Amino acid sequence: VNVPKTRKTYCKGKTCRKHTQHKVTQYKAGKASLFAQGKRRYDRKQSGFGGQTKPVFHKKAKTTKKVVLRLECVKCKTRAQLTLKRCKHFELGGEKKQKGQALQF
Amino acid sequence: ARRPARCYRYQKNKPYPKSRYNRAVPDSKIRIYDLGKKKATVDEFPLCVHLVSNELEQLSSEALEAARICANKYMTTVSGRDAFHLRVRVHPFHVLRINKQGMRGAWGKPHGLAARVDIGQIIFSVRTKDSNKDVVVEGLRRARYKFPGQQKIILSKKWGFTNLDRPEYLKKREAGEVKDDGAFVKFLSKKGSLENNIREFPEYFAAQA
Amino acid sequence: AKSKNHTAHNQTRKAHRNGIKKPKTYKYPSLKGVDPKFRRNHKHALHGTAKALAAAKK
Amino acid sequence: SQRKLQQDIDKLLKKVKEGIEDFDDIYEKFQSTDPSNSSHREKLESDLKREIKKLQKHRDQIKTWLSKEDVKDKQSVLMTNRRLIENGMERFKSVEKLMKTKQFSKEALTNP
Amino acid sequence: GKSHGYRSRTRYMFQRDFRKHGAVHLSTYLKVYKVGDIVDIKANGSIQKGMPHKFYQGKTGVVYNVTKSSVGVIINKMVGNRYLEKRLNLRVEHIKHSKCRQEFLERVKANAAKRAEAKAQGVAVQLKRQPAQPRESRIVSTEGNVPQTLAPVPYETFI
RNA sequence: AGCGCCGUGGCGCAGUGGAAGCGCGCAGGGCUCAUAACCCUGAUGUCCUCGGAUCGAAACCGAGCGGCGCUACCA
RNA sequence: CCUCGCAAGAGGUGCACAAUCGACCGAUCCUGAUGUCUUCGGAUGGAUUUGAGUAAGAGCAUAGCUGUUGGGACCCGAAAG
RNA sequence: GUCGAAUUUGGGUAUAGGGGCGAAAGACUAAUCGAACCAUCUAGUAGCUGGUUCCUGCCGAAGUUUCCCUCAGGAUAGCAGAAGCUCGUAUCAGUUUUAUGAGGUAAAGCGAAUGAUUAGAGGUUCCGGGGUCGAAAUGACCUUGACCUAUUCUCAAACUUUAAAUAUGUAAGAAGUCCUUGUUACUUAAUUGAACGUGGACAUUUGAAUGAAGAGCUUUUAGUGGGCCAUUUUUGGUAAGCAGAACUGGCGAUGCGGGAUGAACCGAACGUAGAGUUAAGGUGCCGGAAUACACGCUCAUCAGACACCACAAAAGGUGUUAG
RNA sequence: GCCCUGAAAAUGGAUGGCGCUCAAGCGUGUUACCUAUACUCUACCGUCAGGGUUGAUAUGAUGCCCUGACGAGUAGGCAGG
RNA sequence: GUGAUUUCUGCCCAGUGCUCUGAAUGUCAAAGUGAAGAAAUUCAACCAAGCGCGGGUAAACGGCGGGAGUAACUAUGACU
RNA sequence: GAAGACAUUGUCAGGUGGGGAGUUUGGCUGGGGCGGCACAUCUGUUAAACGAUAACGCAGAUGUCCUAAGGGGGGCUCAUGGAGAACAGAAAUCUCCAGUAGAACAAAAGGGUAAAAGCCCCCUUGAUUUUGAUUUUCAGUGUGAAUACAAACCAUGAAAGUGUGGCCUAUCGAUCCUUUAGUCCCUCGGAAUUUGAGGCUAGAGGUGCCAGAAAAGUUACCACAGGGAUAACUGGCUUGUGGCAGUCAAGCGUUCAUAGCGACAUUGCUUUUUGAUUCUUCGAUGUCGGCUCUUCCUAUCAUACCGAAGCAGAAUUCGGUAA
RNA sequence: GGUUGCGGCCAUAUCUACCAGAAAGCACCGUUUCCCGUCCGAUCAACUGUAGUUAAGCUGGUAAGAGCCUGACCGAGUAGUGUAGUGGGUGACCAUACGCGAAACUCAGGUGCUGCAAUCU
Ligand SMILES: C[NH+](C)c1cc(NC(=O)CNC(C)(C)C)c(O)c2c1C[C@H]1C[C@H]3[C@H]([NH+](C)C)C(O)=C(C(N)=O)C(=O)[C@@]3(O)C(O)=C1C2=O
Ligand SMILES: C[NH+](C)c1cc(NC(=O)CNC(C)(C)C)c(O)c2c1C[C@H]1C[C@H]3[C@H]([NH+](C)C)C(O)=C(C(N)=O)C(=O)[C@@]3(O)C(O)=C1C2=O
Ligand SMILES: C[NH+](C)c1cc(NC(=O)CNC(C)(C)C)c(O)c2c1C[C@H]1C[C@H]3[C@H]([NH+](C)C)C(O)=C(C(N)=O)C(=O)[C@@]3(O)C(O)=C1C2=O
Ligand SMILES: C[NH+](C)c1cc(NC(=O)CNC(C)(C)C)c(O)c2c1C[C@H]1C[C@H]3[C@H]([NH+](C)C)C(O)=C(C(N)=O)C(=O)[C@@]3(O)C(O)=C1C2=O
Ligand SMILES: [Mg+2]
Ligand SMILES: [Mg+2]
Ligand SMILES: [Mg+2]
Ligand SMILES: [Mg+2]
Ligand SMILES: [Mg+2]
Ligand SMILES: [Mg+2]
Ligand SMILES: [Mg+2]
Ligand SMILES: [Mg+2]
Ligand SMILES: [Mg+2]
Ligand SMILES: [Mg+2]
Ligand SMILES: [Mg+2]
Ligand SMILES: [Mg+2]
Ligand SMILES: [Mg+2]
Ligand SMILES: [Mg+2]
Ligand SMILES: [Mg+2]
Ligand SMILES: [Mg+2]
Ligand SMILES: [Mg+2]
Ligand SMILES: [Mg+2]
Ligand SMILES: [Mg+2]
Ligand SMILES: [Mg+2]
Ligand SMILES: [Mg+2]
Ligand SMILES: [Mg+2]
Ligand SMILES: [Mg+2]
Ligand SMILES: [Mg+2]
Ligand SMILES: [Mg+2]
Ligand SMILES: [Mg+2]
Ligand SMILES: [Mg+2]
Ligand SMILES: [Mg+2]
Ligand SMILES: [Mg+2]
Ligand SMILES: [Mg+2]
Ligand SMILES: [Mg+2]
Ligand SMILES: [Mg+2]
Ligand SMILES: [Mg+2]
Ligand SMILES: [Mg+2]
Ligand SMILES: [Mg+2]
Ligand SMILES: [Mg+2]
């Protein structure tokens, strides 16, 4: 689906609680740091004899991830997240569809 | 093959016709439904003779075609081809089903086509002259054998196939409000337009005999 | 080992052995789901009429 | 089973990749034939025709897989190998037509 | 395989009447509902917003809440061994008044009237309705009406 | 019976929404005393049938026709 | 229960409890006073929010039936490890 | 079968259990071997089988909902018991009436829409295919197809204008009605309305019938979560003592009288006795009770004899009887 | 309408049997009679409910007495022995 | 592995194995090295064997085509 | 003598490693397996006119797509048919008339919609924030979807108004873990500052067996607990199929329906076929064929006695009483 | 009572073909400087009420009109259906008892009513 690079939405910042310009980007997940408590617990549990100790996922069923847009309001530099549904193809600020040109086969 | 009408006899299922949900059904074997001098007039054929049912059952399209053939052959061999008009008054619209492991997935393929007949429903109608009452009765007696269940010949006292018992129809004819159409008649009603009523029934609106 | 799927037999008999009797309506039904606009006013108006009745009673 | 299915996937995946490699090698030797060796031109045509026919069979298997077989994870790599096979097909079609075209045939006399 | 959606088995229920399609009229837009009234729920298929479920079609309830374009209706429904109270938010197109309730109002106005003149002149209040009492002794006149005799008809077939 | 595949020029086969080709045959000319081989050309299709989606397909989706292949096991 | 009344009944007070509207305490979202280590403090007033709360305490201990869980767990019974 | 050896055998010795040994059979390893025997962990676990010990009284089921690697099991709701508690103060009905709604089944309909479908009639071609007169012509005649008009025959679980019966919602007042004026930060142009009120008025019946056997409320816990049959409606199937639904009643859980016999059918439900009267079914004898009465029919060289139910059809017969 | 043909299965065989022919068969009608643990009345047992009875003497007030209704029962619950 | 003698043991190394090479201009752990940081730490480069790349091997496991047309009768098909 | 700070040995790290170890190897199901998904859902029908309602019932669809195909406003009317206009014809573009929707509204189907919910144009982001209440599924739990408000901030329109995604009914996901946004708030517990980590509020990363285990086979060497809840014999219901018999009579038989046959139909019987079913039996009813031996049935091959013939005799065919 | 503005019920109001319409009011009409919108002052916008016309619109009437509506003891107490029987029938199904009760058909009648305000020989 096509979504514009800019969007006027509500801002949660205390300096502006109104509609303000936001720039739109896509949320990419973090680096999954090594010192999170679950990772340290996993390392201690996996160390030793006993093999794999926690389940690992195999029965993948879905093909699509929901897309979620990081909106940064451009005056107070604040960030928000908006979730859009399962779409196979996703473009940020693509060319606008045009009503009524000659098709080009 | 050829399962009996004794196992396709009673009306056990809902009517299951040929529609967009039920395709690839075989055609019926009865294709002609009127027979004899079918272009004759009710002027020519006054007496009606009806083969009617007494049982709520299902008639095969085979039973219809076989009864029509045997009756036709008898009347043409005895009284000639132009002495009668025979019309079959039931149309086979019922797709019968055949099953052909176990009862899993038991919904069956189309096998046939049947005429669901009610009690007191006309199966066969023959219109003829007054002198051929005997031969039309024995032809419909042959029809009663190829047809299952119990059936009756009733001497229908309607002028031809139409309506309107013989004195009433005679009165209408001598009044002149009846126009001869192809194998039927048109009636004058007192509700139409005066101009088109004038141009379609001139004899009622004149002083003719 | 197939078995029975669904049946509504005996269910009405159980329900009417311990019947459907009533939803037990009261005076002053609950104001849950009534408009907050004019619900706030109902609060203020009851406060005012209680104050006025007490002041008239002295 | 899904494990057996994915094993057959990975096998045809590797076969398609090695077929693409040798088809590209035959294609580049064709473009560097030194076309005075017309017999070598025809021989390389027939060889890359055999390789592109093998890719045809692999692509039809990919068609059936993506249609009915519940690939369930790897539609991306199946589609990319389909696209690689089809661009090889159109390269073979262009080469094959190029040497088919007769120098005084009516199409070449109409439009160069 | 099996479906239980919000409008499952609602084909003829949410069809319009014959020659009654199109816009719904300003009588049912301009009727006023106040808190505590008694209304009948019959859904209009043209207005898709605020439709009731198919269970509440043809159901009588008490309106308890009124808002910008809809009213809230209280409906008692039977699940299990008890009635449950349901609070529906329905548009005024799907909401209609109760002629039984209006007839009860005209009856209570008539009853208050009847007790007023009954108290004014001091006899025979007799307010409550009585069911259909057995008929009383009457005299019929043979003058101009001699009983004509009837017989069962024979069996003649008309076909 | 179920499942799957296939159906395209005279024959064996390719073919992806802007849409029909390969090879051998067939036809014309050349070379040769002549025929093959060789050289220069040309023509060739109800895309199995029917219906639908699409702005449009042989291709996409459905119904049948015909021909193949796999399974039909425990007693 | 009290008062009046012969009684029927009329009024007053109405514990428990039930329904409903409020008030108070904590959390969340606000508003942000006197002021001040000018970045601290959070007065006051709110909010279709929320708590297993307050609103003249009821609990603690013991015994018993029944029920729950864990123990061999009503009794007998494997192929196994 | 073999019988001078790849022979037979004694004694000694070696190899020990996931080990040995095997010219290999998963063979053998103390009557034990597809992993010995002994003791212990161990009274291992079992949603599975069997059993589970005195009497009487009172009440008295479920085989259904949702979820579960759930389908021989559990949890949850339901049905049941017990303890009761607050009142006996106008409360509620597996019910009817009156009033008002809602429905799209049965039926009906197709010269009403959609779809199917029979047959002719009258027409229209600057515009279907043939032939004829033809050089052809926005020429002519006839034949056959379609398109239109007025008719006709038959139909539809996933068609419908219409539209029942039975089931189904609500109301039939004191928490009600009418009059007057108080509150508000809601609403209105506005003391305009909305909601809640104060103070008066209203009764003979307090606003249809009938019945109430007490009404309402709470806690806790058992068993059950295999069902089956009958009337009616109904799906698949040729059908089934088949499979699967709907409403009700039953069996399970239940004896008694009848159906000779039978879980379900008919009657009627049960403390212990006596008398009387009956139900269903019967009254020749077995067998209690009329070889009663009355009007007829039937003679079978396989009569017939009572619902569920334990079978018989099409087609015939100067057999007989009545039309 | 009744009867007959249609109408053929394997142990001997079943309107229940014997038997029945102006029936003891079939259709219909009228009475009389038989009979259930059902209904009516009475007695007794138990349960439940409502109620009466601390007065002196003599005993138990959870006791005595009056009135009415009711009584099937697996799994299961409770109670008195 | 096969199973006296006799006569022979055809073709296929694509797959699976096995085995050779050695730097492919891949992958590449720990230790070690460098940079940033106040440090924990992070990011780099380097990175053995093995996989990967490239050969050999079938008395290794194993495997070893389908449709048409075609010869003076028909059939068949040496042939295409 | 040889070898030599290399082997060896010790500890870590990578590879290999069914040689060995441990475990697993879904469910529904007219027995199981194969097949399918009836396993989470949506439409019409079954479904018996409130609601609910089953089967491996019928006909289909879903795991998407869309910055517009969302929101507001304005203007216009669609499919089709007829009549016309150079090239231009069946179909290019233009014009008029008729046109209740016969079009279109992303998709399955069903509803709904005409100065619109369709088509064209203009402006936009309400597909936003804060949490609550309600409806469906339902335990009145969750998820999903939806409804009506309140408090803001906005969009559009002259305005009333409308707008919290798609005209409506489907289009989707807990704990733990990771990650992001907000508060930049709380904690690191001897006291501080800064990194780091842990919290709180709201999303995402996914469990399709869709209330959500991390999971390959084989056993003809097999074992145990059970099951007639469940198959392979018989028996029992049924008789499609098999077999046998009627009825009708178009025709065959030179001529002639019926000497013998007999189409197209149509009614039955049987349980010696094979199915369908799962009622009994899984704490065992010894299971194919043959031999042996007895009885019974008749649907009669022969024999007895008869009738008919397209029976001259002979031979033969049809039928009866007959087991 | 006609007409206009705004409406309620939404065909007794619609559709087809003709005829009539004093007054007023609507309407058609005349014009493009301005605001405004179009390929086109045709629609829309503005201006004039002047130059004219009831031709159309609109209103009303006519039609053994189509359609629609109402009623009928018209069909028909028919089809169907709730309850009951140890009723009939081999069965399919069908009668009876107590109840409810259609649709098509046929026939007859009708063809907008009305509210608020303003105006009119
Ligand atoms: C006739 N009495 C016995 C009676 C009966 C009922 N309820 C019934 O009808 C019975 N309910 C059944 C039908 C049994 C379920 C009743 O409900 C009542 C009453 C009495 C009234 C008396 C009322 C009275 N005044 C105000 C009229 C009175 O004196 C007082 C008072 N001032 O205290 C009351 O208590 C009184 O208001 C009252 O409560 C009565 C009833 O509710
Ligand atoms: C319908 N009758 C039975 C009735 C019912 C209720 N209660 C309700 O309906 C309650 N409302 C609910 C349903 C709870 C919302 C009632 O509340 C009443 C009454 C009756 C009256 C009788 C009055 C009468 N007065 C007027 C003289 C009377 O005879 C007396 C009396 N003096 O004894 C009364 O008790 C009477 O005044 C009265 O109080 C009645 C009711 O309250
Ligand atoms: C001087 N070179 C020829 C060499 C010689 C010997 N050994 C000898 O001296 C004995 N060999 C002779 C007698 C000359 C045949 C060597 O032993 C070596 C080397 C070279 C290095 C190269 C290293 C290098 N690393 C640092 C990236 C490299 O390019 C590789 C490589 N990936 O090919 C290496 O492996 C390397 O580390 C290396 O191992 C070398 C030698 O050991
Ligand atoms: C033939 N030798 C001289 C050699 C040369 C080079 N260098 C080159 O080939 C460089 N030439 C270019 C330009 C890259 C083509 C080499 O790169 C190498 C080698 C051999 C081995 C040496 C190996 C040795 N091992 C067996 C004990 C060794 O000393 C080491 C080590 N401990 O570093 C190795 O790893 C060694 O295996 C190795 O890497 C070698 C080479 O790669
Ligand atoms: Mg480790
Ligand atoms: Mg069950
Ligand atoms: Mg199921
Ligand atoms: Mg409706
Ligand atoms: Mg919406
Ligand atoms: Mg040539
Ligand atoms: Mg040549
Ligand atoms: Mg034990
Ligand atoms: Mg315990
Ligand atoms: Mg043990
Ligand atoms: Mg173990
Ligand atoms: Mg020795
Ligand atoms: Mg041994
Ligand atoms: Mg699970
Ligand atoms: Mg069991
Ligand atoms: Mg009271
Ligand atoms: Mg009602
Ligand atoms: Mg329906
Ligand atoms: Mg019908
Ligand atoms: Mg109708
Ligand atoms: Mg029709
Ligand atoms: Mg009172
Ligand atoms: Mg329970
Ligand atoms: Mg339970
Ligand atoms: Mg039991
Ligand atoms: Mg009983
Ligand atoms: Mg009965
Ligand atoms: Mg007695
Ligand atoms: Mg006796
Ligand atoms: Mg007969
Ligand atoms: Mg007779
Ligand atoms: Mg007989
Ligand atoms: Mg007797
Ligand atoms: Mg008698
Ligand atoms: Mg007592
Ligand atoms: Mg070997």
Ligand SMILES: [Mg+2]
């Ligand atoms: Mg190889």
Ligand SMILES: [Mg+2]
């Ligand atoms: Mg190899």
Ligand SMILES: [Mg+2]
């Ligand atoms: Mg490293």
Ligand SMILES: [Mg+2]
């Ligand atoms: Mg390496």
Ligand SMILES: [Mg+2]
């Ligand atoms: Mg293993």
Ligand SMILES: [Mg+2]
């Ligand atoms: Mg299973």
Ligand SMILES: [Mg+2]
């Ligand atoms: Mg329903």
Ligand SMILES: [Mg+2]
């Ligand atoms: Mg839209």
Ligand SMILES: [Mg+2]
């Ligand atoms: Mg609009």
Ligand SMILES: [Mg+2]
């Ligand atoms: Mg929910």
Ligand SMILES: [Mg+2]
């Ligand atoms: Mg809003």
Ligand SMILES: [Mg+2]
């Ligand atoms: Mg965390």
Ligand SMILES: [Mg+2]
């Ligand atoms: Mg999530």
Ligand SMILES: [Mg+2]
């Ligand atoms: Mg689940």
Ligand SMILES: [Mg+2]
């Ligand atoms: Mg195993």
Ligand SMILES: [Mg+2]
């Ligand atoms: Mg086995």
